[PDB]
PDB file of C-alpha atoms and ligand atoms in Angstrom:
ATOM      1  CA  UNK A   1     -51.427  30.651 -49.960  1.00 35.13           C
ATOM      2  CA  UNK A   2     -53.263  28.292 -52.883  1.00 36.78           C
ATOM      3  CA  UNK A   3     -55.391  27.411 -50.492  1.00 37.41           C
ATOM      4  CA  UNK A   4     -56.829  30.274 -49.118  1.00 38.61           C
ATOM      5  CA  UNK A   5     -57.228  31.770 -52.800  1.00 40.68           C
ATOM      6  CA  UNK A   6     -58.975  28.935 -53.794  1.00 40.35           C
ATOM      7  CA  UNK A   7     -61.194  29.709 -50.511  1.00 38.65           C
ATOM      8  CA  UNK A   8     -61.532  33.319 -51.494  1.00 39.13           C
ATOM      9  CA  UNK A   9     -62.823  32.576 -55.299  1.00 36.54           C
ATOM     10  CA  UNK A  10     -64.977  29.959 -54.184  1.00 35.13           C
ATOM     11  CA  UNK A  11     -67.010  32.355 -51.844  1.00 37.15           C
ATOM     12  CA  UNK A  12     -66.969  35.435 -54.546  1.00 41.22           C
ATOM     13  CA  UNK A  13     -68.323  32.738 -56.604  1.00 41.46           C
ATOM     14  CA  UNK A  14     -71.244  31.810 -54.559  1.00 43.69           C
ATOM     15  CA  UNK A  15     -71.379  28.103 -55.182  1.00 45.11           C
ATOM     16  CA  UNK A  16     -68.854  25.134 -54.833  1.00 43.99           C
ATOM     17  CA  UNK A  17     -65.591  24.406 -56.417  1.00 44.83           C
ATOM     18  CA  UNK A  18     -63.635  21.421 -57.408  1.00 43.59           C
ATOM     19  CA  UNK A  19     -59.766  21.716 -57.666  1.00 46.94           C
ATOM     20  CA  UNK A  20     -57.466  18.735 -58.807  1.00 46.42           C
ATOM     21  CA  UNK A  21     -54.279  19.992 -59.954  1.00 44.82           C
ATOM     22  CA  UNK A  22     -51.531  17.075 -60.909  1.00 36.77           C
ATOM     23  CA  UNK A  23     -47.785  18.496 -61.356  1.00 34.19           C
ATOM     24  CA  UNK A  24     -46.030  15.947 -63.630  1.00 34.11           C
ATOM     25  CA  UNK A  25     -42.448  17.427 -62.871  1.00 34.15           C
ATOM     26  CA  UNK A  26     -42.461  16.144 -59.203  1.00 35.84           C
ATOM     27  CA  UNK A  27     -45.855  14.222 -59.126  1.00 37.91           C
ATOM     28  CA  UNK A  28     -47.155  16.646 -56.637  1.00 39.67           C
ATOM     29  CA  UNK A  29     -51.075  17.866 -56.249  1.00 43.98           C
ATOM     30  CA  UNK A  30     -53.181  20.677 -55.553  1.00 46.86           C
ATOM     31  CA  UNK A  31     -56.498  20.071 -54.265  1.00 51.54           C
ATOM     32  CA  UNK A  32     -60.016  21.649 -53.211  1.00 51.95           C
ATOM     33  CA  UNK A  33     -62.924  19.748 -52.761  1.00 52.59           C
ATOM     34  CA  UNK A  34     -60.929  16.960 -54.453  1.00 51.39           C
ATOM     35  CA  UNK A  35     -62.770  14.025 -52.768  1.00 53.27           C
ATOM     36  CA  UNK A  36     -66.227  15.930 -53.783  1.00 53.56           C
ATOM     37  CA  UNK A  37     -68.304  14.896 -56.267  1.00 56.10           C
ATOM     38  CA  UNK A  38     -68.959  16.779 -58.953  1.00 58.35           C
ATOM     39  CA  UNK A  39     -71.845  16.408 -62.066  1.00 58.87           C
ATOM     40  CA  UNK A  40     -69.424  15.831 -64.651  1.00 60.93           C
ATOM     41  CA  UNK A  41     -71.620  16.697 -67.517  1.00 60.15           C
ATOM     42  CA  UNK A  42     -69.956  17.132 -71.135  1.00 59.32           C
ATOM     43  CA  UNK A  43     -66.562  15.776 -69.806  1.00 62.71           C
ATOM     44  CA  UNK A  44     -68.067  13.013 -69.464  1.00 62.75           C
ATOM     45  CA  UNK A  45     -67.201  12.389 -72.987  1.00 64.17           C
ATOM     46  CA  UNK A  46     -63.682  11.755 -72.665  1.00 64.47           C
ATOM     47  CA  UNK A  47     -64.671   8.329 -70.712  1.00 64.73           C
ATOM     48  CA  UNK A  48     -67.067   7.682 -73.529  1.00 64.18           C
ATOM     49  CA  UNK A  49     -64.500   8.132 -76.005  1.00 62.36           C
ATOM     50  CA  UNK A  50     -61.756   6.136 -74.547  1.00 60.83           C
ATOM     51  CA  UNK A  51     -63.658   3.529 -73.690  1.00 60.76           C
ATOM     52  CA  UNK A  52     -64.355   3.028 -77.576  1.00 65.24           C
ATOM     53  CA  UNK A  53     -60.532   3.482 -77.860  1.00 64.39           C
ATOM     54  CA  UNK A  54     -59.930   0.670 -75.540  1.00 63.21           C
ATOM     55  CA  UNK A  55     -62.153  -1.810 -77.821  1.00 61.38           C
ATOM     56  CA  UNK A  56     -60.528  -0.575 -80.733  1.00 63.45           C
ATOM     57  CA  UNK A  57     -57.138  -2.197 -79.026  1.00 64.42           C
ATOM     58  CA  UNK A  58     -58.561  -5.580 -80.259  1.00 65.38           C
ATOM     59  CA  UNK A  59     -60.771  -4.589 -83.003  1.00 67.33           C
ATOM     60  CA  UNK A  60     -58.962  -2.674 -85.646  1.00 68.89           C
ATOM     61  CA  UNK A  61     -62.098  -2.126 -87.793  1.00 70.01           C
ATOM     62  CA  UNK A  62     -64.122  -0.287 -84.862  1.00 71.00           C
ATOM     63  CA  UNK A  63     -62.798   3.313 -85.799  1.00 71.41           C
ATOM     64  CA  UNK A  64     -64.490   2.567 -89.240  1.00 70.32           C
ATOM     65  CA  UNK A  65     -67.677   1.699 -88.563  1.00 67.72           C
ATOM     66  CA  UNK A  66     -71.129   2.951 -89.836  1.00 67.25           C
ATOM     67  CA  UNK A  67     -73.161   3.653 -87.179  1.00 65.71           C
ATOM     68  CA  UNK A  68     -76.661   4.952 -88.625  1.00 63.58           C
ATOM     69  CA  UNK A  69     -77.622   8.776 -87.784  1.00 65.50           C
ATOM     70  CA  UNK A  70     -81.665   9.232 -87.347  1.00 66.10           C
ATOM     71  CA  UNK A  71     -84.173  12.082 -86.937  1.00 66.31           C
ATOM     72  CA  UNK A  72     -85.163   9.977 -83.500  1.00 63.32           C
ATOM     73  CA  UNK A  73     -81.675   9.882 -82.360  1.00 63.71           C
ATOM     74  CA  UNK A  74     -81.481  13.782 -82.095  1.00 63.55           C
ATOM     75  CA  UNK A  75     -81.676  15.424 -78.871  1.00 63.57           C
ATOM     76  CA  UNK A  76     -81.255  19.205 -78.785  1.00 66.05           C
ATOM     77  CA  UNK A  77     -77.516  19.637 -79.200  1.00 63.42           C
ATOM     78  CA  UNK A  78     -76.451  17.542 -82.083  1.00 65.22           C
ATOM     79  CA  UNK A  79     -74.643  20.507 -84.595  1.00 69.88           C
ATOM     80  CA  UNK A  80     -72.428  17.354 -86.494  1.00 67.36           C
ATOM     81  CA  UNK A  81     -74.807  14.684 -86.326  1.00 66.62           C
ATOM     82  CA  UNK A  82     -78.261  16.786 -87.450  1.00 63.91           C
ATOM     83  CA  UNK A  83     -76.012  16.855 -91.168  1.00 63.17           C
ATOM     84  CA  UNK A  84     -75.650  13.069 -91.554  1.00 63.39           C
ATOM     85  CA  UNK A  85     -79.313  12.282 -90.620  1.00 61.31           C
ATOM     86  CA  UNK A  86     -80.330   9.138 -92.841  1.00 58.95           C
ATOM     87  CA  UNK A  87     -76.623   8.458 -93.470  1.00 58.22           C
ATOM     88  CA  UNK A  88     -73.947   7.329 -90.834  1.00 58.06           C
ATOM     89  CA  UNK A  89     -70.903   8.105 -89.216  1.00 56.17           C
ATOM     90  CA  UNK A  90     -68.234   6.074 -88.311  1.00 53.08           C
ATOM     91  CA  UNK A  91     -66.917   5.951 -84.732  1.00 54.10           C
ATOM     92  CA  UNK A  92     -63.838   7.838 -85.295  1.00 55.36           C
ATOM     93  CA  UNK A  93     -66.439  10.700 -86.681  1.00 55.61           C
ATOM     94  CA  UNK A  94     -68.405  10.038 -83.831  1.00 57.86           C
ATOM     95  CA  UNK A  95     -65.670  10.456 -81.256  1.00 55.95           C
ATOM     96  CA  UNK A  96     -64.291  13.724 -82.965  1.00 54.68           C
ATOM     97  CA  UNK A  97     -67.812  15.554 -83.150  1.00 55.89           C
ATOM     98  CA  UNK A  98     -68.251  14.496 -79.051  1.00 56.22           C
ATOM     99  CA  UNK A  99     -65.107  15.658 -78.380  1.00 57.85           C
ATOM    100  CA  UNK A 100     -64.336  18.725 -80.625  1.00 57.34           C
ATOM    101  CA  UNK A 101     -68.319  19.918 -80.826  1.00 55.93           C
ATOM    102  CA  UNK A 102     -69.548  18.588 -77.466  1.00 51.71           C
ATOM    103  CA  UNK A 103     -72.433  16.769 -79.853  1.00 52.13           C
ATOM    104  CA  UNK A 104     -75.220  14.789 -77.604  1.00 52.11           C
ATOM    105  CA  UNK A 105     -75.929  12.852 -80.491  1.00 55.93           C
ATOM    106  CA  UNK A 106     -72.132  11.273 -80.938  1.00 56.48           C
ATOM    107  CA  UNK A 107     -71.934  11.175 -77.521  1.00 58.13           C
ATOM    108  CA  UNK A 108     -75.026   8.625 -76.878  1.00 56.26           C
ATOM    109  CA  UNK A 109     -73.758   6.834 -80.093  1.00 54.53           C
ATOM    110  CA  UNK A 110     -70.517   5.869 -77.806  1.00 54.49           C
ATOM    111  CA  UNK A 111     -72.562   5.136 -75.166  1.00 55.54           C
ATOM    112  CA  UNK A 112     -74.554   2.619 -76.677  1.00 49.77           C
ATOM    113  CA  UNK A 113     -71.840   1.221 -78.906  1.00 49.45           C
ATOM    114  CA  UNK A 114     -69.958  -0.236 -75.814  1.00 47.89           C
ATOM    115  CA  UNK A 115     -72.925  -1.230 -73.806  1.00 46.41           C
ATOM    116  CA  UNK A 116     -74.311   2.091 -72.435  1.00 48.28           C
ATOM    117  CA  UNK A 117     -73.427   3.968 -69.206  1.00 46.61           C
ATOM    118  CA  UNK A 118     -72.590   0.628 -66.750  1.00 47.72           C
ATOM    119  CA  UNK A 119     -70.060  -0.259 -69.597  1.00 47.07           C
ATOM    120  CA  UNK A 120     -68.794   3.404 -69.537  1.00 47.38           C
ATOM    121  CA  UNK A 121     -68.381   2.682 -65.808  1.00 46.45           C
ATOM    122  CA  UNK A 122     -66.946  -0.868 -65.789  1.00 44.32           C
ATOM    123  CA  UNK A 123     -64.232   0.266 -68.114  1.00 43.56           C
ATOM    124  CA  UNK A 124     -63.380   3.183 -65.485  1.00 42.67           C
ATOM    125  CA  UNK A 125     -63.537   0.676 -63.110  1.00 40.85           C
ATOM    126  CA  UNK A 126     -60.929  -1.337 -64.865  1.00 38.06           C
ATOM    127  CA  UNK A 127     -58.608   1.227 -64.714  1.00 40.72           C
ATOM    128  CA  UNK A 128     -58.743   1.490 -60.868  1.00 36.99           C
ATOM    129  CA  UNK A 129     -60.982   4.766 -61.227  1.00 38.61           C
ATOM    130  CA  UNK A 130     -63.565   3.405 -58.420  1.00 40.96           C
ATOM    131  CA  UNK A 131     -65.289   6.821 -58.354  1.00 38.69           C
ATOM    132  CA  UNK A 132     -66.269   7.900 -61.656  1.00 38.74           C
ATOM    133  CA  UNK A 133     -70.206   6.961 -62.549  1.00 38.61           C
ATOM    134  CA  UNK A 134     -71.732   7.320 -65.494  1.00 38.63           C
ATOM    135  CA  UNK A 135     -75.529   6.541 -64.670  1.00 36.48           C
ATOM    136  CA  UNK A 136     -77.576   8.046 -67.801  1.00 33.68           C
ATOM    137  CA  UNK A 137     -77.361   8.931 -71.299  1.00 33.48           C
ATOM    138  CA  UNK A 138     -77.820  12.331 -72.901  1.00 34.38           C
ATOM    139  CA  UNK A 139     -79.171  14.799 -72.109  1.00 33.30           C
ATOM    140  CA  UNK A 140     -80.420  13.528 -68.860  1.00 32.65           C
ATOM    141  CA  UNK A 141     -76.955  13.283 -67.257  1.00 32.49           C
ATOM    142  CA  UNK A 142     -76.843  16.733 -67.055  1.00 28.47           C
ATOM    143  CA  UNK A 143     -78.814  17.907 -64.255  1.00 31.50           C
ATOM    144  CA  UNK A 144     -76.472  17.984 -61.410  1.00 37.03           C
ATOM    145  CA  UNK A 145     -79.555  18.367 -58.871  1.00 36.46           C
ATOM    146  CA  UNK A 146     -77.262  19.486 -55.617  1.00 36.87           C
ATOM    147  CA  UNK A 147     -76.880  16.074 -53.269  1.00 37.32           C
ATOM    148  CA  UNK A 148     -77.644  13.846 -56.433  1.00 36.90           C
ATOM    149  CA  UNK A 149     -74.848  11.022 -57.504  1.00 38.98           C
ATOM    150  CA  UNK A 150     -75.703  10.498 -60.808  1.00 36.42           C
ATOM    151  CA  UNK A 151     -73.233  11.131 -63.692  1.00 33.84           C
ATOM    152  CA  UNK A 152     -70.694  12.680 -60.969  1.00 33.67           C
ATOM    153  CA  UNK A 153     -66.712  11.931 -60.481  1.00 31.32           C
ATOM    154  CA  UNK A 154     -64.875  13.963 -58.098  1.00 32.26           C
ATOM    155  CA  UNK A 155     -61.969  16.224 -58.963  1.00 29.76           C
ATOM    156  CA  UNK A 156     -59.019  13.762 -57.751  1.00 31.29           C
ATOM    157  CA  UNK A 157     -60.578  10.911 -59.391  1.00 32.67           C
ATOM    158  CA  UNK A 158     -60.834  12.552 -62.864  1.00 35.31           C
ATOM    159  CA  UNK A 159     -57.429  14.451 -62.907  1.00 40.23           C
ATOM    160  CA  UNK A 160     -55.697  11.025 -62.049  1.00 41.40           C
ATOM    161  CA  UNK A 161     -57.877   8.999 -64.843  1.00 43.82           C
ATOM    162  CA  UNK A 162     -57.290  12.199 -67.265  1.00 46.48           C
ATOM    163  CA  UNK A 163     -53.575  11.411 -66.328  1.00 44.33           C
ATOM    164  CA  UNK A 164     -53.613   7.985 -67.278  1.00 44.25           C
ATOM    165  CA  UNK A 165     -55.542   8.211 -70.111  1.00 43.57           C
ATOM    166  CA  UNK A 166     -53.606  11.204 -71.517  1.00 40.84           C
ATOM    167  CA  UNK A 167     -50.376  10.644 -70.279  1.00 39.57           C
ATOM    168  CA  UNK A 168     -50.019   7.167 -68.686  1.00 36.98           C
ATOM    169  CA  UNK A 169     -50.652   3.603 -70.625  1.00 40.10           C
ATOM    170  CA  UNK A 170     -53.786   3.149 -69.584  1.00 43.24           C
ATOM    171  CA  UNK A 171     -54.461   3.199 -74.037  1.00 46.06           C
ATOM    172  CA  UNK A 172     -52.355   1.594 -76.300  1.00 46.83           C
ATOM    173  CA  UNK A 173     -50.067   4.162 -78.045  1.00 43.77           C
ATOM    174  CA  UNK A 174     -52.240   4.933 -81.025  1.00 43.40           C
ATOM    175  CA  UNK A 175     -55.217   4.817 -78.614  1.00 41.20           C
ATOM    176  CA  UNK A 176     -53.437   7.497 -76.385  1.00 39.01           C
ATOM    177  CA  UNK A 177     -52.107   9.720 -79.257  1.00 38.44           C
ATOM    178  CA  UNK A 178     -55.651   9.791 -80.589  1.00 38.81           C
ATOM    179  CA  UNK A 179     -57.078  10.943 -77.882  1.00 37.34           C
ATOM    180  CA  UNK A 180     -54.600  13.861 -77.285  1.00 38.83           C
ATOM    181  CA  UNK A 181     -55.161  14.493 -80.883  1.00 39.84           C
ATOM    182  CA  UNK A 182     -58.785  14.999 -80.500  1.00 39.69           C
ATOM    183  CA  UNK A 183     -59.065  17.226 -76.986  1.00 37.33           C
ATOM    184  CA  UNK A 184     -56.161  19.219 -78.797  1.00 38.38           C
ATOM    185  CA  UNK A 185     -58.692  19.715 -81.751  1.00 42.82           C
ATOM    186  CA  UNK A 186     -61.486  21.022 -79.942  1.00 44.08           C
ATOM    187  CA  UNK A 187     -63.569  24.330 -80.605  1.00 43.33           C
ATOM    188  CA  UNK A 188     -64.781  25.456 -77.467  1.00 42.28           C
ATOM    189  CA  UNK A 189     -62.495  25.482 -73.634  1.00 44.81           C
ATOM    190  CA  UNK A 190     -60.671  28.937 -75.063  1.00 44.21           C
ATOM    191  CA  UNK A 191     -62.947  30.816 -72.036  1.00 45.37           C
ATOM    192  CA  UNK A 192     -62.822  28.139 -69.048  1.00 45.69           C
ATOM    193  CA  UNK A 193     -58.729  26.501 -67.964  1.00 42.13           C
ATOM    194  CA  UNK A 194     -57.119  27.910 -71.082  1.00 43.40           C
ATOM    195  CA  UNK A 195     -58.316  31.833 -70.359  1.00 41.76           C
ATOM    196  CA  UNK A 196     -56.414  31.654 -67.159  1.00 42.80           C
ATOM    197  CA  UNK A 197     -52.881  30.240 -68.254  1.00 38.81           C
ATOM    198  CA  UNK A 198     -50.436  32.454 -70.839  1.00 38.64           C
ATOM    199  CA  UNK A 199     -51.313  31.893 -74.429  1.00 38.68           C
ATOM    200  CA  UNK A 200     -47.701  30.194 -75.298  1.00 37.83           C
ATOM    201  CA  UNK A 201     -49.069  26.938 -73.508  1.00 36.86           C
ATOM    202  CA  UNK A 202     -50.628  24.054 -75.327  1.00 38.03           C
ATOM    203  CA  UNK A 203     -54.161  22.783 -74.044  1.00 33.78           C
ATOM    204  CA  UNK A 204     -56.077  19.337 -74.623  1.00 36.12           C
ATOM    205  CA  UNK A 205     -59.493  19.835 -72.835  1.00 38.18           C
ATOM    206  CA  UNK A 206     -62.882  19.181 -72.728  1.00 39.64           C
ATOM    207  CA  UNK A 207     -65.796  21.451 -70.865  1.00 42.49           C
ATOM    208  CA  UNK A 208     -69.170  20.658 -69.725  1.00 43.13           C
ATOM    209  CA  UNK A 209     -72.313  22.906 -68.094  1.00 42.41           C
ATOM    210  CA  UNK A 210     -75.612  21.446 -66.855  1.00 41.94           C
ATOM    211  CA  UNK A 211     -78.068  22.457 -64.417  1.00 42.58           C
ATOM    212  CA  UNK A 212     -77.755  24.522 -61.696  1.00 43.67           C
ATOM    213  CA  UNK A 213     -75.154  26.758 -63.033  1.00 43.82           C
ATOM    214  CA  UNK A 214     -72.779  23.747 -63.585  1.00 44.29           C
ATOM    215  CA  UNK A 215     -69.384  24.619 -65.391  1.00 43.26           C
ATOM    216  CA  UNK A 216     -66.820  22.483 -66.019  1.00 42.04           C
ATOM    217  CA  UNK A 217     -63.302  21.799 -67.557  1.00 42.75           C
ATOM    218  CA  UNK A 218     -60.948  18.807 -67.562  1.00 45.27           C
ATOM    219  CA  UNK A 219     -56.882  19.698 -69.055  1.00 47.22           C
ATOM    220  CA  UNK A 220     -53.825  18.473 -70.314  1.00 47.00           C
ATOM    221  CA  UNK A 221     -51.671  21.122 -70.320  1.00 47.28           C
ATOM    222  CA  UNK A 222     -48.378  21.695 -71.879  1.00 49.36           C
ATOM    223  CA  UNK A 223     -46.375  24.740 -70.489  1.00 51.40           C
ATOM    224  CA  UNK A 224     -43.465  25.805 -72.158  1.00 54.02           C
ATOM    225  CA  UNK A 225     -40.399  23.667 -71.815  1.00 53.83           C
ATOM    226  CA  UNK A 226     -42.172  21.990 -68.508  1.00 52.61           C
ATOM    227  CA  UNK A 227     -43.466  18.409 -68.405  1.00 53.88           C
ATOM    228  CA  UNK A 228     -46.657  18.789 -68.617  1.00 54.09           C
ATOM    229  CA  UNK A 229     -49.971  19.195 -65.975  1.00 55.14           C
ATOM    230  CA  UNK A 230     -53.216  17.824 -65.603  1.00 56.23           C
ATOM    231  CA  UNK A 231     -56.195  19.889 -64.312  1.00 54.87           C
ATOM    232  CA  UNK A 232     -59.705  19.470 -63.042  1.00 53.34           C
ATOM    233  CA  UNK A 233     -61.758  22.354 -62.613  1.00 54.86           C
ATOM    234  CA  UNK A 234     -65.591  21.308 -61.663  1.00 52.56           C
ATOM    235  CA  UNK A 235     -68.086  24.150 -60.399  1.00 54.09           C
ATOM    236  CA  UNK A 236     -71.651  24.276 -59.392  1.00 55.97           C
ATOM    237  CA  UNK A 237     -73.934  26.692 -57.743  1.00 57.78           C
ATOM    238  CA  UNK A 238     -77.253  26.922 -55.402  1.00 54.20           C
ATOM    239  CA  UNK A 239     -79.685  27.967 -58.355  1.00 52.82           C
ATOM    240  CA  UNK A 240     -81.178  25.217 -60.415  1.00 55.03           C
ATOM    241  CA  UNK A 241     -81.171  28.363 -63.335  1.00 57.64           C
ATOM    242  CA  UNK A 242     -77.838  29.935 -62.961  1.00 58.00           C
ATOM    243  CA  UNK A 243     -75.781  31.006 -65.538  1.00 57.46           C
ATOM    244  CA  UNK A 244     -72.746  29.122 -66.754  1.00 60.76           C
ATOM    245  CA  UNK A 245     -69.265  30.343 -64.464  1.00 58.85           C
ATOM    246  CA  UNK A 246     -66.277  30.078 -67.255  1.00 59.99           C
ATOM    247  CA  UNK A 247     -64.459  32.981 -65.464  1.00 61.30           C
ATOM    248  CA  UNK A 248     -64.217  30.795 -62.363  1.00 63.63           C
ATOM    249  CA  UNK A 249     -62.170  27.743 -63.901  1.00 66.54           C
ATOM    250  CA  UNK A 250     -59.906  30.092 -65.580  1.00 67.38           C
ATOM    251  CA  UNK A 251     -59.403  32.028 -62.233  1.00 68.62           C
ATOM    252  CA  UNK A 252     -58.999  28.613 -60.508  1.00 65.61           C
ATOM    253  CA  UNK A 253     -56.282  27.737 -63.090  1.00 67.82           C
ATOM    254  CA  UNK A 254     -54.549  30.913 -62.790  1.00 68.40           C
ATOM    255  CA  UNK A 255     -54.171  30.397 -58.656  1.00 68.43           C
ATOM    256  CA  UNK A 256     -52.909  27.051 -59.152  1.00 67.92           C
ATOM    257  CA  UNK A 257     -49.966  27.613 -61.939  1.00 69.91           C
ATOM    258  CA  UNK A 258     -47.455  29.598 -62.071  1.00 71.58           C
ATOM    259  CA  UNK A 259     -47.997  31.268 -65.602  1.00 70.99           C
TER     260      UNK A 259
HETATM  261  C1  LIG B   1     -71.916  19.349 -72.139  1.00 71.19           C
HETATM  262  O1  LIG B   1     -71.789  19.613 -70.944  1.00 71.19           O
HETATM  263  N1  LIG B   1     -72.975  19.828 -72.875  1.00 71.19           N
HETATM  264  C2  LIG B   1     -73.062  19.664 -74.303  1.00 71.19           C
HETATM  265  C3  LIG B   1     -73.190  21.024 -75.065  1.00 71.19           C
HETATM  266  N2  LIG B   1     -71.857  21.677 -75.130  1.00 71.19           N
HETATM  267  O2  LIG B   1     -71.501  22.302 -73.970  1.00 71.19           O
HETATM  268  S1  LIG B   1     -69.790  22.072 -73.736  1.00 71.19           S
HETATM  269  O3  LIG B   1     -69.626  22.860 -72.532  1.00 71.19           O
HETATM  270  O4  LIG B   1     -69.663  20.706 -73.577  1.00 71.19           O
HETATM  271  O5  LIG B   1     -69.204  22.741 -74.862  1.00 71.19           O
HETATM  272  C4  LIG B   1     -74.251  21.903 -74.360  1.00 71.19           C
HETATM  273  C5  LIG B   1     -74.170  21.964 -72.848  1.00 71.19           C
HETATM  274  C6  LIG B   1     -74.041  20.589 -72.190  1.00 71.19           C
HETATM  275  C7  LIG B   1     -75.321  19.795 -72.270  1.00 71.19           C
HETATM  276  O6  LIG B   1     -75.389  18.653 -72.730  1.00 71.19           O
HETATM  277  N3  LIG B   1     -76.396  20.444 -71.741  1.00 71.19           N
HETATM  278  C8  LIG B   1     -77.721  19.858 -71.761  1.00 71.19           C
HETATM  279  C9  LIG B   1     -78.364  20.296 -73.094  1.00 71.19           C
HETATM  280  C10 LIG B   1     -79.799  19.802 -73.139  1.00 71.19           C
HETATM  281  N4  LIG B   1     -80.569  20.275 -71.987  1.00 71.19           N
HETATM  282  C11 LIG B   1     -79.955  19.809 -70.750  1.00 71.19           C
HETATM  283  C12 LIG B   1     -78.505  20.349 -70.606  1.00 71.19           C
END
């Protein structure tokens, strides 16, 4: 059974594995670890960037504005922002390069916009996701030390926020079309959730990897004339320098669909 699959890949693997698996068509669930926590890493983002799409509700200007680009607000991983340094961005652009190019920079620019990572939280918080934390900006938040809380959701928590956020009304319905928009858009996931499900199905996602071999991907997922499916797929391994583990979502997503 799912289970015992799951089981299997997780010890070929050698590390730990996160499994939320949310079934629109009969609100049903497939879970692994689900209660876990998990260093969330790059997906991350998606909070970040609905959380700006939240204030935007009540501030119709927000998408527009300029927020300044400088040479000491790059990190290492910045492949949108490093072009606009001196010049600015607006949110929207922001939003889009953190969610489509997994940019630091854009990233800590939504961060800071709405108050930094206890604002990140408290807006989680607000829509009854009591688990996810967002503790630190980039790139610390990717470190995922084994034992370590910071920056970590577990898989239940995120698939049911992805759900809302995605799916649900936890946006209003610009807010919520935007952000399918954007995780539609993006340039990288093609290896991790969306390598194990046929190529007919439609994917909004958003991956993440950090220390200790940490590989990540959080999914939307449109199958062919099906309502649709939300999946978390967190890994993480024993060796502070292990090597990223895309094969392992996409095997995870393969056990848990029928595709
Ligand atoms: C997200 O987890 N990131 C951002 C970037 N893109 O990876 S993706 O998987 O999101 O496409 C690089 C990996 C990761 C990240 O921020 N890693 C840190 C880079 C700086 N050193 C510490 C790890």
């Amino acid at each position: 059974d799912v289970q015992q699959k799951l089981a299997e890949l997780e010890r070929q693997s050698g590390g730990r594995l996160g499994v939320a698996l949310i079934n629109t068509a009969d609100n049903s669930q497939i879970l692994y670890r689900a209660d876990e926590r998990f260093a969330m890493c790059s997906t991350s983002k998606v909070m970040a960037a609905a959380a700006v799409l939240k204030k935007s509700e009540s501030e119709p200007s927000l998408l527009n504005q300029r927020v300044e680009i400088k040479k000491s607000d790059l990190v290492n991983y910045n492949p949108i922002a490093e072009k606009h340094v001196n010049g600015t961005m607006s949110l929207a652009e922001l939003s889009a390069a953190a969610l489509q190019y997994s940019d630091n920079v854009a990233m800590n620019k939504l961060i800071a916009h709405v108050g930094g990572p206890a604002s990140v939280t408290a807006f989680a918080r607000q829509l009854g996701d009591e688990t996810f934390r967002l503790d630190r900006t980039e790139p610390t938040l990717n470190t995922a030390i084994p034992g370590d809380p910071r920056d970590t959701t577990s898989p239940r928590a995120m698939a049911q926020t992805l759900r809302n956020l995605t799916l649900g009304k936890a946006l209003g319905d610009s807010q919520r079309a935007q952000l399918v928009t954007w995780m539609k858009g993006n340039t990288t996931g093609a290896a991790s959730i969306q390598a194990g499900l046929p190529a007919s199905w439609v994917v909004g996602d958003k991956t993440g990897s950090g220390g200790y071999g940490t590989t990540n991907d959080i999914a939307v997922i449109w199958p062919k004339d099906r309502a649709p499916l939300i999946l978390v797929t967190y890994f993480t391994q024993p060796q502070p320098k292990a090597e990223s583990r895309r094969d392992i979502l996409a095997s995870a997503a393969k056990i848990v669909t029928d595709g």
